[PDB]
PDB file of C-alpha atoms and ligand atoms in Angstrom:
ATOM      1  CA  UNK A   1       0.868  19.056 -10.947  1.00  0.00           C
ATOM      2  CA  UNK A   2       2.091  17.469 -14.218  1.00  0.00           C
ATOM      3  CA  UNK A   3       4.202  14.353 -13.786  1.00  0.00           C
ATOM      4  CA  UNK A   4       3.515  13.795 -10.089  1.00  0.00           C
ATOM      5  CA  UNK A   5       3.552  10.224  -8.802  1.00  0.00           C
ATOM      6  CA  UNK A   6       0.283   9.269  -7.114  1.00  0.00           C
ATOM      7  CA  UNK A   7      -0.484   5.950  -5.449  1.00  0.00           C
ATOM      8  CA  UNK A   8      -3.451   4.199  -3.849  1.00  0.00           C
ATOM      9  CA  UNK A   9      -3.900   2.370  -0.560  1.00  0.00           C
ATOM     10  CA  UNK A  10      -6.841   0.269   0.586  1.00  0.00           C
ATOM     11  CA  UNK A  11      -7.303   0.481   4.387  1.00  0.00           C
ATOM     12  CA  UNK A  12     -10.089  -0.151   6.911  1.00  0.00           C
ATOM     13  CA  UNK A  13      -9.445   3.023   8.919  1.00  0.00           C
ATOM     14  CA  UNK A  14     -11.618   6.093   8.127  1.00  0.00           C
ATOM     15  CA  UNK A  15     -10.532   9.505   6.729  1.00  0.00           C
ATOM     16  CA  UNK A  16     -11.082  11.269  10.030  1.00  0.00           C
ATOM     17  CA  UNK A  17      -8.270   9.245  11.567  1.00  0.00           C
ATOM     18  CA  UNK A  18      -6.149   8.876   8.443  1.00  0.00           C
ATOM     19  CA  UNK A  19      -6.346  12.477   7.156  1.00  0.00           C
ATOM     20  CA  UNK A  20      -5.165  13.603  10.571  1.00  0.00           C
ATOM     21  CA  UNK A  21      -2.603  10.919  11.399  1.00  0.00           C
ATOM     22  CA  UNK A  22      -1.519   9.554   8.037  1.00  0.00           C
ATOM     23  CA  UNK A  23      -0.331   5.951   7.832  1.00  0.00           C
ATOM     24  CA  UNK A  24       2.309   4.325  10.028  1.00  0.00           C
ATOM     25  CA  UNK A  25       3.989   0.946   9.499  1.00  0.00           C
ATOM     26  CA  UNK A  26       3.568  -1.916  11.974  1.00  0.00           C
ATOM     27  CA  UNK A  27       7.238  -1.871  12.897  1.00  0.00           C
ATOM     28  CA  UNK A  28      10.793  -1.636  11.615  1.00  0.00           C
ATOM     29  CA  UNK A  29      11.324  -5.026   9.926  1.00  0.00           C
ATOM     30  CA  UNK A  30      12.904  -4.354   6.517  1.00  0.00           C
ATOM     31  CA  UNK A  31      12.676  -7.925   5.183  1.00  0.00           C
ATOM     32  CA  UNK A  32      11.051  -7.025   1.870  1.00  0.00           C
ATOM     33  CA  UNK A  33      10.196 -10.587   0.817  1.00  0.00           C
ATOM     34  CA  UNK A  34       8.428 -11.102   4.153  1.00  0.00           C
ATOM     35  CA  UNK A  35       6.415  -7.948   3.588  1.00  0.00           C
ATOM     36  CA  UNK A  36       5.495  -8.787  -0.007  1.00  0.00           C
ATOM     37  CA  UNK A  37       4.204 -12.220   1.083  1.00  0.00           C
ATOM     38  CA  UNK A  38       2.108 -10.669   3.837  1.00  0.00           C
ATOM     39  CA  UNK A  39       4.061 -12.492   6.537  1.00  0.00           C
ATOM     40  CA  UNK A  40       5.050  -9.339   8.421  1.00  0.00           C
ATOM     41  CA  UNK A  41       1.736  -7.534   7.993  1.00  0.00           C
ATOM     42  CA  UNK A  42      -1.550  -7.690   9.897  1.00  0.00           C
ATOM     43  CA  UNK A  43      -2.075 -11.416   9.324  1.00  0.00           C
ATOM     44  CA  UNK A  44       1.510 -12.222  10.301  1.00  0.00           C
ATOM     45  CA  UNK A  45       4.271 -10.950  12.603  1.00  0.00           C
ATOM     46  CA  UNK A  46       2.836  -7.413  12.395  1.00  0.00           C
ATOM     47  CA  UNK A  47       6.199  -5.653  12.358  1.00  0.00           C
ATOM     48  CA  UNK A  48       6.680  -4.696   8.693  1.00  0.00           C
ATOM     49  CA  UNK A  49       8.730  -1.553   8.071  1.00  0.00           C
ATOM     50  CA  UNK A  50       6.706  -0.862   4.982  1.00  0.00           C
ATOM     51  CA  UNK A  51       3.293   0.593   4.088  1.00  0.00           C
ATOM     52  CA  UNK A  52       1.902  -1.036   0.940  1.00  0.00           C
ATOM     53  CA  UNK A  53       0.487   1.023  -1.939  1.00  0.00           C
ATOM     54  CA  UNK A  54      -0.212   0.459  -5.640  1.00  0.00           C
ATOM     55  CA  UNK A  55      -0.206   2.675  -8.722  1.00  0.00           C
ATOM     56  CA  UNK A  56      -3.138   0.710 -10.141  1.00  0.00           C
ATOM     57  CA  UNK A  57      -6.766   1.705  -9.528  1.00  0.00           C
ATOM     58  CA  UNK A  58      -7.802  -1.592 -11.072  1.00  0.00           C
ATOM     59  CA  UNK A  59      -5.679  -3.445  -8.523  1.00  0.00           C
ATOM     60  CA  UNK A  60      -7.319  -1.617  -5.595  1.00  0.00           C
ATOM     61  CA  UNK A  61     -10.753  -3.101  -6.361  1.00  0.00           C
ATOM     62  CA  UNK A  62      -9.257  -6.592  -6.390  1.00  0.00           C
ATOM     63  CA  UNK A  63      -7.390  -6.057  -3.129  1.00  0.00           C
ATOM     64  CA  UNK A  64     -10.624  -4.790  -1.563  1.00  0.00           C
ATOM     65  CA  UNK A  65     -12.524  -7.835  -2.880  1.00  0.00           C
ATOM     66  CA  UNK A  66      -9.955 -10.129  -1.281  1.00  0.00           C
ATOM     67  CA  UNK A  67     -10.452  -8.457   2.097  1.00  0.00           C
ATOM     68  CA  UNK A  68     -14.254  -8.125   1.817  1.00  0.00           C
ATOM     69  CA  UNK A  69     -14.733 -11.784   1.014  1.00  0.00           C
ATOM     70  CA  UNK A  70     -12.475 -13.108   3.773  1.00  0.00           C
ATOM     71  CA  UNK A  71     -14.186 -14.845   6.709  1.00  0.00           C
ATOM     72  CA  UNK A  72     -14.647 -12.817   9.857  1.00  0.00           C
ATOM     73  CA  UNK A  73     -14.134  -9.588   7.931  1.00  0.00           C
ATOM     74  CA  UNK A  74     -16.591  -6.921   9.006  1.00  0.00           C
ATOM     75  CA  UNK A  75     -16.598  -3.161   8.605  1.00  0.00           C
ATOM     76  CA  UNK A  76     -15.623  -0.879   5.767  1.00  0.00           C
ATOM     77  CA  UNK A  77     -12.757  -0.299   3.379  1.00  0.00           C
ATOM     78  CA  UNK A  78     -11.575   2.969   1.883  1.00  0.00           C
ATOM     79  CA  UNK A  79      -9.388   3.681  -1.125  1.00  0.00           C
ATOM     80  CA  UNK A  80      -6.972   6.511  -0.352  1.00  0.00           C
ATOM     81  CA  UNK A  81      -5.229   8.485  -3.077  1.00  0.00           C
ATOM     82  CA  UNK A  82      -1.764   9.560  -2.016  1.00  0.00           C
ATOM     83  CA  UNK A  83       0.952  11.841  -3.359  1.00  0.00           C
ATOM     84  CA  UNK A  84       4.178   9.837  -3.459  1.00  0.00           C
ATOM     85  CA  UNK A  85       7.558  11.327  -2.596  1.00  0.00           C
ATOM     86  CA  UNK A  86      11.057  10.109  -1.656  1.00  0.00           C
ATOM     87  CA  UNK A  87       9.539   8.075   1.203  1.00  0.00           C
ATOM     88  CA  UNK A  88       8.083   5.783  -1.486  1.00  0.00           C
ATOM     89  CA  UNK A  89      10.035   3.109  -3.382  1.00  0.00           C
ATOM     90  CA  UNK A  90       9.007   0.994  -6.355  1.00  0.00           C
ATOM     91  CA  UNK A  91       9.944  -2.559  -5.366  1.00  0.00           C
ATOM     92  CA  UNK A  92      11.781  -3.652  -8.523  1.00  0.00           C
ATOM     93  CA  UNK A  93      15.258  -2.139  -7.863  1.00  0.00           C
ATOM     94  CA  UNK A  94      15.227  -3.733  -4.426  1.00  0.00           C
ATOM     95  CA  UNK A  95      14.050  -7.086  -5.771  1.00  0.00           C
ATOM     96  CA  UNK A  96      16.914  -6.905  -8.291  1.00  0.00           C
ATOM     97  CA  UNK A  97      19.373  -6.059  -5.515  1.00  0.00           C
ATOM     98  CA  UNK A  98      18.193  -8.908  -3.256  1.00  0.00           C
ATOM     99  CA  UNK A  99      18.545 -11.240  -6.246  1.00  0.00           C
ATOM    100  CA  UNK A 100      22.172 -10.089  -6.797  1.00  0.00           C
ATOM    101  CA  UNK A 101      22.697 -10.813  -3.122  1.00  0.00           C
ATOM    102  CA  UNK A 102      21.564 -14.397  -3.568  1.00  0.00           C
ATOM    103  CA  UNK A 103      17.991 -14.134  -2.355  1.00  0.00           C
ATOM    104  CA  UNK A 104      15.637 -16.327  -4.407  1.00  0.00           C
ATOM    105  CA  UNK A 105      12.210 -15.262  -5.567  1.00  0.00           C
ATOM    106  CA  UNK A 106      10.034 -18.170  -6.670  1.00  0.00           C
ATOM    107  CA  UNK A 107       8.327 -18.415 -10.037  1.00  0.00           C
ATOM    108  CA  UNK A 108       5.080 -17.697  -8.219  1.00  0.00           C
ATOM    109  CA  UNK A 109       6.398 -14.562  -6.509  1.00  0.00           C
ATOM    110  CA  UNK A 110       7.658 -13.160  -9.809  1.00  0.00           C
ATOM    111  CA  UNK A 111       4.287 -13.771 -11.445  1.00  0.00           C
ATOM    112  CA  UNK A 112       2.636 -11.827  -8.605  1.00  0.00           C
ATOM    113  CA  UNK A 113       5.054  -8.877  -9.175  1.00  0.00           C
ATOM    114  CA  UNK A 114       4.778  -9.022 -12.950  1.00  0.00           C
ATOM    115  CA  UNK A 115       2.784  -5.845 -13.558  1.00  0.00           C
ATOM    116  CA  UNK A 116       5.185  -3.726 -11.479  1.00  0.00           C
ATOM    117  CA  UNK A 117       2.580  -1.567  -9.719  1.00  0.00           C
ATOM    118  CA  UNK A 118       3.801  -2.189  -6.178  1.00  0.00           C
ATOM    119  CA  UNK A 119       5.285   0.730  -4.275  1.00  0.00           C
ATOM    120  CA  UNK A 120       6.144   0.728  -0.574  1.00  0.00           C
ATOM    121  CA  UNK A 121       6.482   3.697   1.762  1.00  0.00           C
ATOM    122  CA  UNK A 122       8.919   3.402   4.600  1.00  0.00           C
ATOM    123  CA  UNK A 123       7.744   3.987   8.205  1.00  0.00           C
ATOM    124  CA  UNK A 124       5.204   6.795   7.738  1.00  0.00           C
ATOM    125  CA  UNK A 125       3.026   8.565   5.192  1.00  0.00           C
ATOM    126  CA  UNK A 126       1.950  11.988   6.502  1.00  0.00           C
ATOM    127  CA  UNK A 127      -1.724  12.994   6.444  1.00  0.00           C
ATOM    128  CA  UNK A 128      -0.701  15.979   4.332  1.00  0.00           C
ATOM    129  CA  UNK A 129       0.253  13.587   1.498  1.00  0.00           C
ATOM    130  CA  UNK A 130      -3.240  12.141   1.302  1.00  0.00           C
ATOM    131  CA  UNK A 131      -5.426  13.715  -1.358  1.00  0.00           C
ATOM    132  CA  UNK A 132      -8.767  12.067  -0.729  1.00  0.00           C
ATOM    133  CA  UNK A 133     -10.651   8.971   0.321  1.00  0.00           C
ATOM    134  CA  UNK A 134     -13.466   6.922  -1.194  1.00  0.00           C
ATOM    135  CA  UNK A 135     -15.583   4.508   0.882  1.00  0.00           C
ATOM    136  CA  UNK A 136     -15.882   1.208  -1.005  1.00  0.00           C
ATOM    137  CA  UNK A 137     -19.186  -0.648  -1.234  1.00  0.00           C
ATOM    138  CA  UNK A 138     -19.405  -4.456  -1.450  1.00  0.00           C
ATOM    139  CA  UNK A 139     -22.157  -6.634  -2.929  1.00  0.00           C
ATOM    140  CA  UNK A 140     -21.301 -10.053  -1.569  1.00  0.00           C
ATOM    141  CA  UNK A 141     -23.878 -11.794  -3.792  1.00  0.00           C
ATOM    142  CA  UNK A 142     -22.134 -10.811  -7.063  1.00  0.00           C
ATOM    143  CA  UNK A 143     -18.612 -10.127  -5.739  1.00  0.00           C
ATOM    144  CA  UNK A 144     -18.994  -6.501  -6.859  1.00  0.00           C
ATOM    145  CA  UNK A 145     -16.921  -3.614  -5.470  1.00  0.00           C
ATOM    146  CA  UNK A 146     -17.907  -0.010  -6.255  1.00  0.00           C
ATOM    147  CA  UNK A 147     -17.153   3.555  -5.109  1.00  0.00           C
ATOM    148  CA  UNK A 148     -19.271   4.965  -2.294  1.00  0.00           C
ATOM    149  CA  UNK A 149     -19.052   8.502  -0.858  1.00  0.00           C
ATOM    150  CA  UNK A 150     -15.808  10.371  -1.437  1.00  0.00           C
ATOM    151  CA  UNK A 151     -14.121  12.731   0.994  1.00  0.00           C
ATOM    152  CA  UNK A 152     -11.492  15.383   0.242  1.00  0.00           C
ATOM    153  CA  UNK A 153      -8.619  16.034   2.632  1.00  0.00           C
ATOM    154  CA  UNK A 154      -8.643  19.801   3.168  1.00  0.00           C
ATOM    155  CA  UNK A 155      -5.198  19.503   4.790  1.00  0.00           C
ATOM    156  CA  UNK A 156      -3.585  18.028   1.652  1.00  0.00           C
ATOM    157  CA  UNK A 157      -0.338  19.790   0.693  1.00  0.00           C
ATOM    158  CA  UNK A 158      -0.030  20.086  -3.103  1.00  0.00           C
ATOM    159  CA  UNK A 159       3.201  19.663  -5.023  1.00  0.00           C
ATOM    160  CA  UNK A 160       4.874  17.750  -7.807  1.00  0.00           C
ATOM    161  CA  UNK A 161       6.969  15.048  -6.161  1.00  0.00           C
ATOM    162  CA  UNK A 162       8.291  11.593  -7.145  1.00  0.00           C
ATOM    163  CA  UNK A 163       9.248   8.209  -5.689  1.00  0.00           C
ATOM    164  CA  UNK A 164      12.851   7.441  -4.772  1.00  0.00           C
ATOM    165  CA  UNK A 165      14.156   5.600  -7.844  1.00  0.00           C
ATOM    166  CA  UNK A 166      16.711   3.533  -5.945  1.00  0.00           C
ATOM    167  CA  UNK A 167      17.205   0.579  -3.627  1.00  0.00           C
ATOM    168  CA  UNK A 168      15.537   0.579  -0.213  1.00  0.00           C
ATOM    169  CA  UNK A 169      18.249   1.284   2.394  1.00  0.00           C
ATOM    170  CA  UNK A 170      18.953  -0.985   5.360  1.00  0.00           C
ATOM    171  CA  UNK A 171      17.260  -4.022   3.785  1.00  0.00           C
ATOM    172  CA  UNK A 172      17.349  -7.321   5.680  1.00  0.00           C
ATOM    173  CA  UNK A 173      19.254  -9.933   3.666  1.00  0.00           C
ATOM    174  CA  UNK A 174      19.093 -13.313   5.448  1.00  0.00           C
TER     175      UNK A 174
HETATM  176  N1  LIG B   1      -3.381  -2.406   1.117  1.00  0.00           N
HETATM  177  C1  LIG B   1      -3.002  -2.112  -0.130  1.00  0.00           C
HETATM  178  O1  LIG B   1      -3.530  -1.103  -0.851  1.00  0.00           O
HETATM  179  C2  LIG B   1      -2.040  -2.929  -0.753  1.00  0.00           C
HETATM  180  C3  LIG B   1      -1.459  -2.532  -1.956  1.00  0.00           C
HETATM  181  C4  LIG B   1      -0.521  -3.346  -2.589  1.00  0.00           C
HETATM  182  C5  LIG B   1      -0.121  -4.560  -2.039  1.00  0.00           C
HETATM  183  N2  LIG B   1      -0.693  -4.988  -0.828  1.00  0.00           N
HETATM  184  C6  LIG B   1      -0.266  -6.277  -0.175  1.00  0.00           C
HETATM  185  O2  LIG B   1      -1.270  -6.775   0.727  1.00  0.00           O
HETATM  186  C7  LIG B   1      -0.591  -7.482   1.821  1.00  0.00           C
HETATM  187  C8  LIG B   1      -1.099  -6.804   3.098  1.00  0.00           C
HETATM  188  O3  LIG B   1      -0.924  -5.385   2.989  1.00  0.00           O
HETATM  189  P1  LIG B   1      -1.849  -4.355   3.774  1.00  0.00           P
HETATM  190  O4  LIG B   1      -1.222  -3.014   3.609  1.00  0.00           O
HETATM  191  O5  LIG B   1      -3.265  -4.574   3.407  1.00  0.00           O
HETATM  192  O6  LIG B   1      -1.603  -4.925   5.277  1.00  0.00           O
HETATM  193  P2  LIG B   1      -1.587  -4.009   6.564  1.00  0.00           P
HETATM  194  O7  LIG B   1      -1.258  -4.885   7.718  1.00  0.00           O
HETATM  195  O8  LIG B   1      -0.757  -2.805   6.298  1.00  0.00           O
HETATM  196  O9  LIG B   1      -3.133  -3.504   6.663  1.00  0.00           O
HETATM  197  C9  LIG B   1      -4.242  -4.352   7.003  1.00  0.00           C
HETATM  198  C10 LIG B   1      -5.051  -3.641   8.108  1.00  0.00           C
HETATM  199  O10 LIG B   1      -4.275  -3.576   9.343  1.00  0.00           O
HETATM  200  C11 LIG B   1      -4.576  -2.292   9.965  1.00  0.00           C
HETATM  201  N3  LIG B   1      -3.230  -1.624  10.055  1.00  0.00           N
HETATM  202  C12 LIG B   1      -2.210  -1.502   9.206  1.00  0.00           C
HETATM  203  N4  LIG B   1      -1.233  -0.839   9.830  1.00  0.00           N
HETATM  204  C13 LIG B   1      -1.635  -0.566  11.074  1.00  0.00           C
HETATM  205  C14 LIG B   1      -1.042   0.069  12.102  1.00  0.00           C
HETATM  206  N5  LIG B   1       0.186   0.534  11.891  1.00  0.00           N
HETATM  207  N6  LIG B   1      -1.650   0.237  13.288  1.00  0.00           N
HETATM  208  C15 LIG B   1      -2.936  -0.276  13.450  1.00  0.00           C
HETATM  209  N7  LIG B   1      -3.536  -0.931  12.366  1.00  0.00           N
HETATM  210  C16 LIG B   1      -2.870  -1.061  11.207  1.00  0.00           C
HETATM  211  C17 LIG B   1      -5.658  -1.661   9.074  1.00  0.00           C
HETATM  212  O11 LIG B   1      -6.892  -2.260   9.432  1.00  0.00           O
HETATM  213  C18 LIG B   1      -5.252  -2.204   7.734  1.00  0.00           C
HETATM  214  O12 LIG B   1      -6.355  -2.133   6.780  1.00  0.00           O
HETATM  215  C19 LIG B   1       0.922  -7.267   1.625  1.00  0.00           C
HETATM  216  O13 LIG B   1       1.487  -8.328   0.847  1.00  0.00           O
HETATM  217  C20 LIG B   1       0.888  -6.007   0.782  1.00  0.00           C
HETATM  218  O14 LIG B   1       2.133  -5.817   0.074  1.00  0.00           O
HETATM  219  C21 LIG B   1      -1.649  -4.150  -0.203  1.00  0.00           C
HETATM  220 NA1  LIG B   2      19.591   5.713  -3.568  1.00  0.00          NA
END
């Protein structure tokens, strides 16, 4: 309904798995800077506490392009639309908190976070939060990403819910 926070996630797993199981984080590592760099995700230590999402549809195409054009990447990508709730945190309050704690974000990191569309979910997004999926198509010759077939999650639970506006609890502060 009106006002509800929705986010997107690009993932290689298909709706049949994801609508049923939802998303689960790699692990329980709450080092946010590590996560935001990608160091604790699939290409890294694979123990991130967080599940990455974005508010920006425009950003999802670019994320998908990055994955599609990487060497050894095969298979498909889907854009999931997700209802956000108190499991979801915009990163800015936490970045501000880490900064007050003496953690340094480089000029480059701050440029990457500039548009403020990043939202992380902690531990688990239920299948019932996921509205729908769209298979993404890739034309490697013109670096073009478009929407393929869409699928609706019949198990979606409607409601008007919002992100947690605060700092992520139990953050790791080295
Ligand atoms: N994916 C997004 O929509 C998205 C949005 C905003 C920012 N980012 C940034 O991209 C970087 C990587 O994020 P990501 O979410 O793509 O990495 P990720 O490790 O969460 O996902 C990459 C792939 O790993 C697999 N995967 C993820 N979790 C799994 C699990 N628990 N069990 C088995 N397989 C799993 C899936 O193939 C997934 O597509 C981070 O810096 C992140 O903040 C991603
Ligand atoms: Na709080």
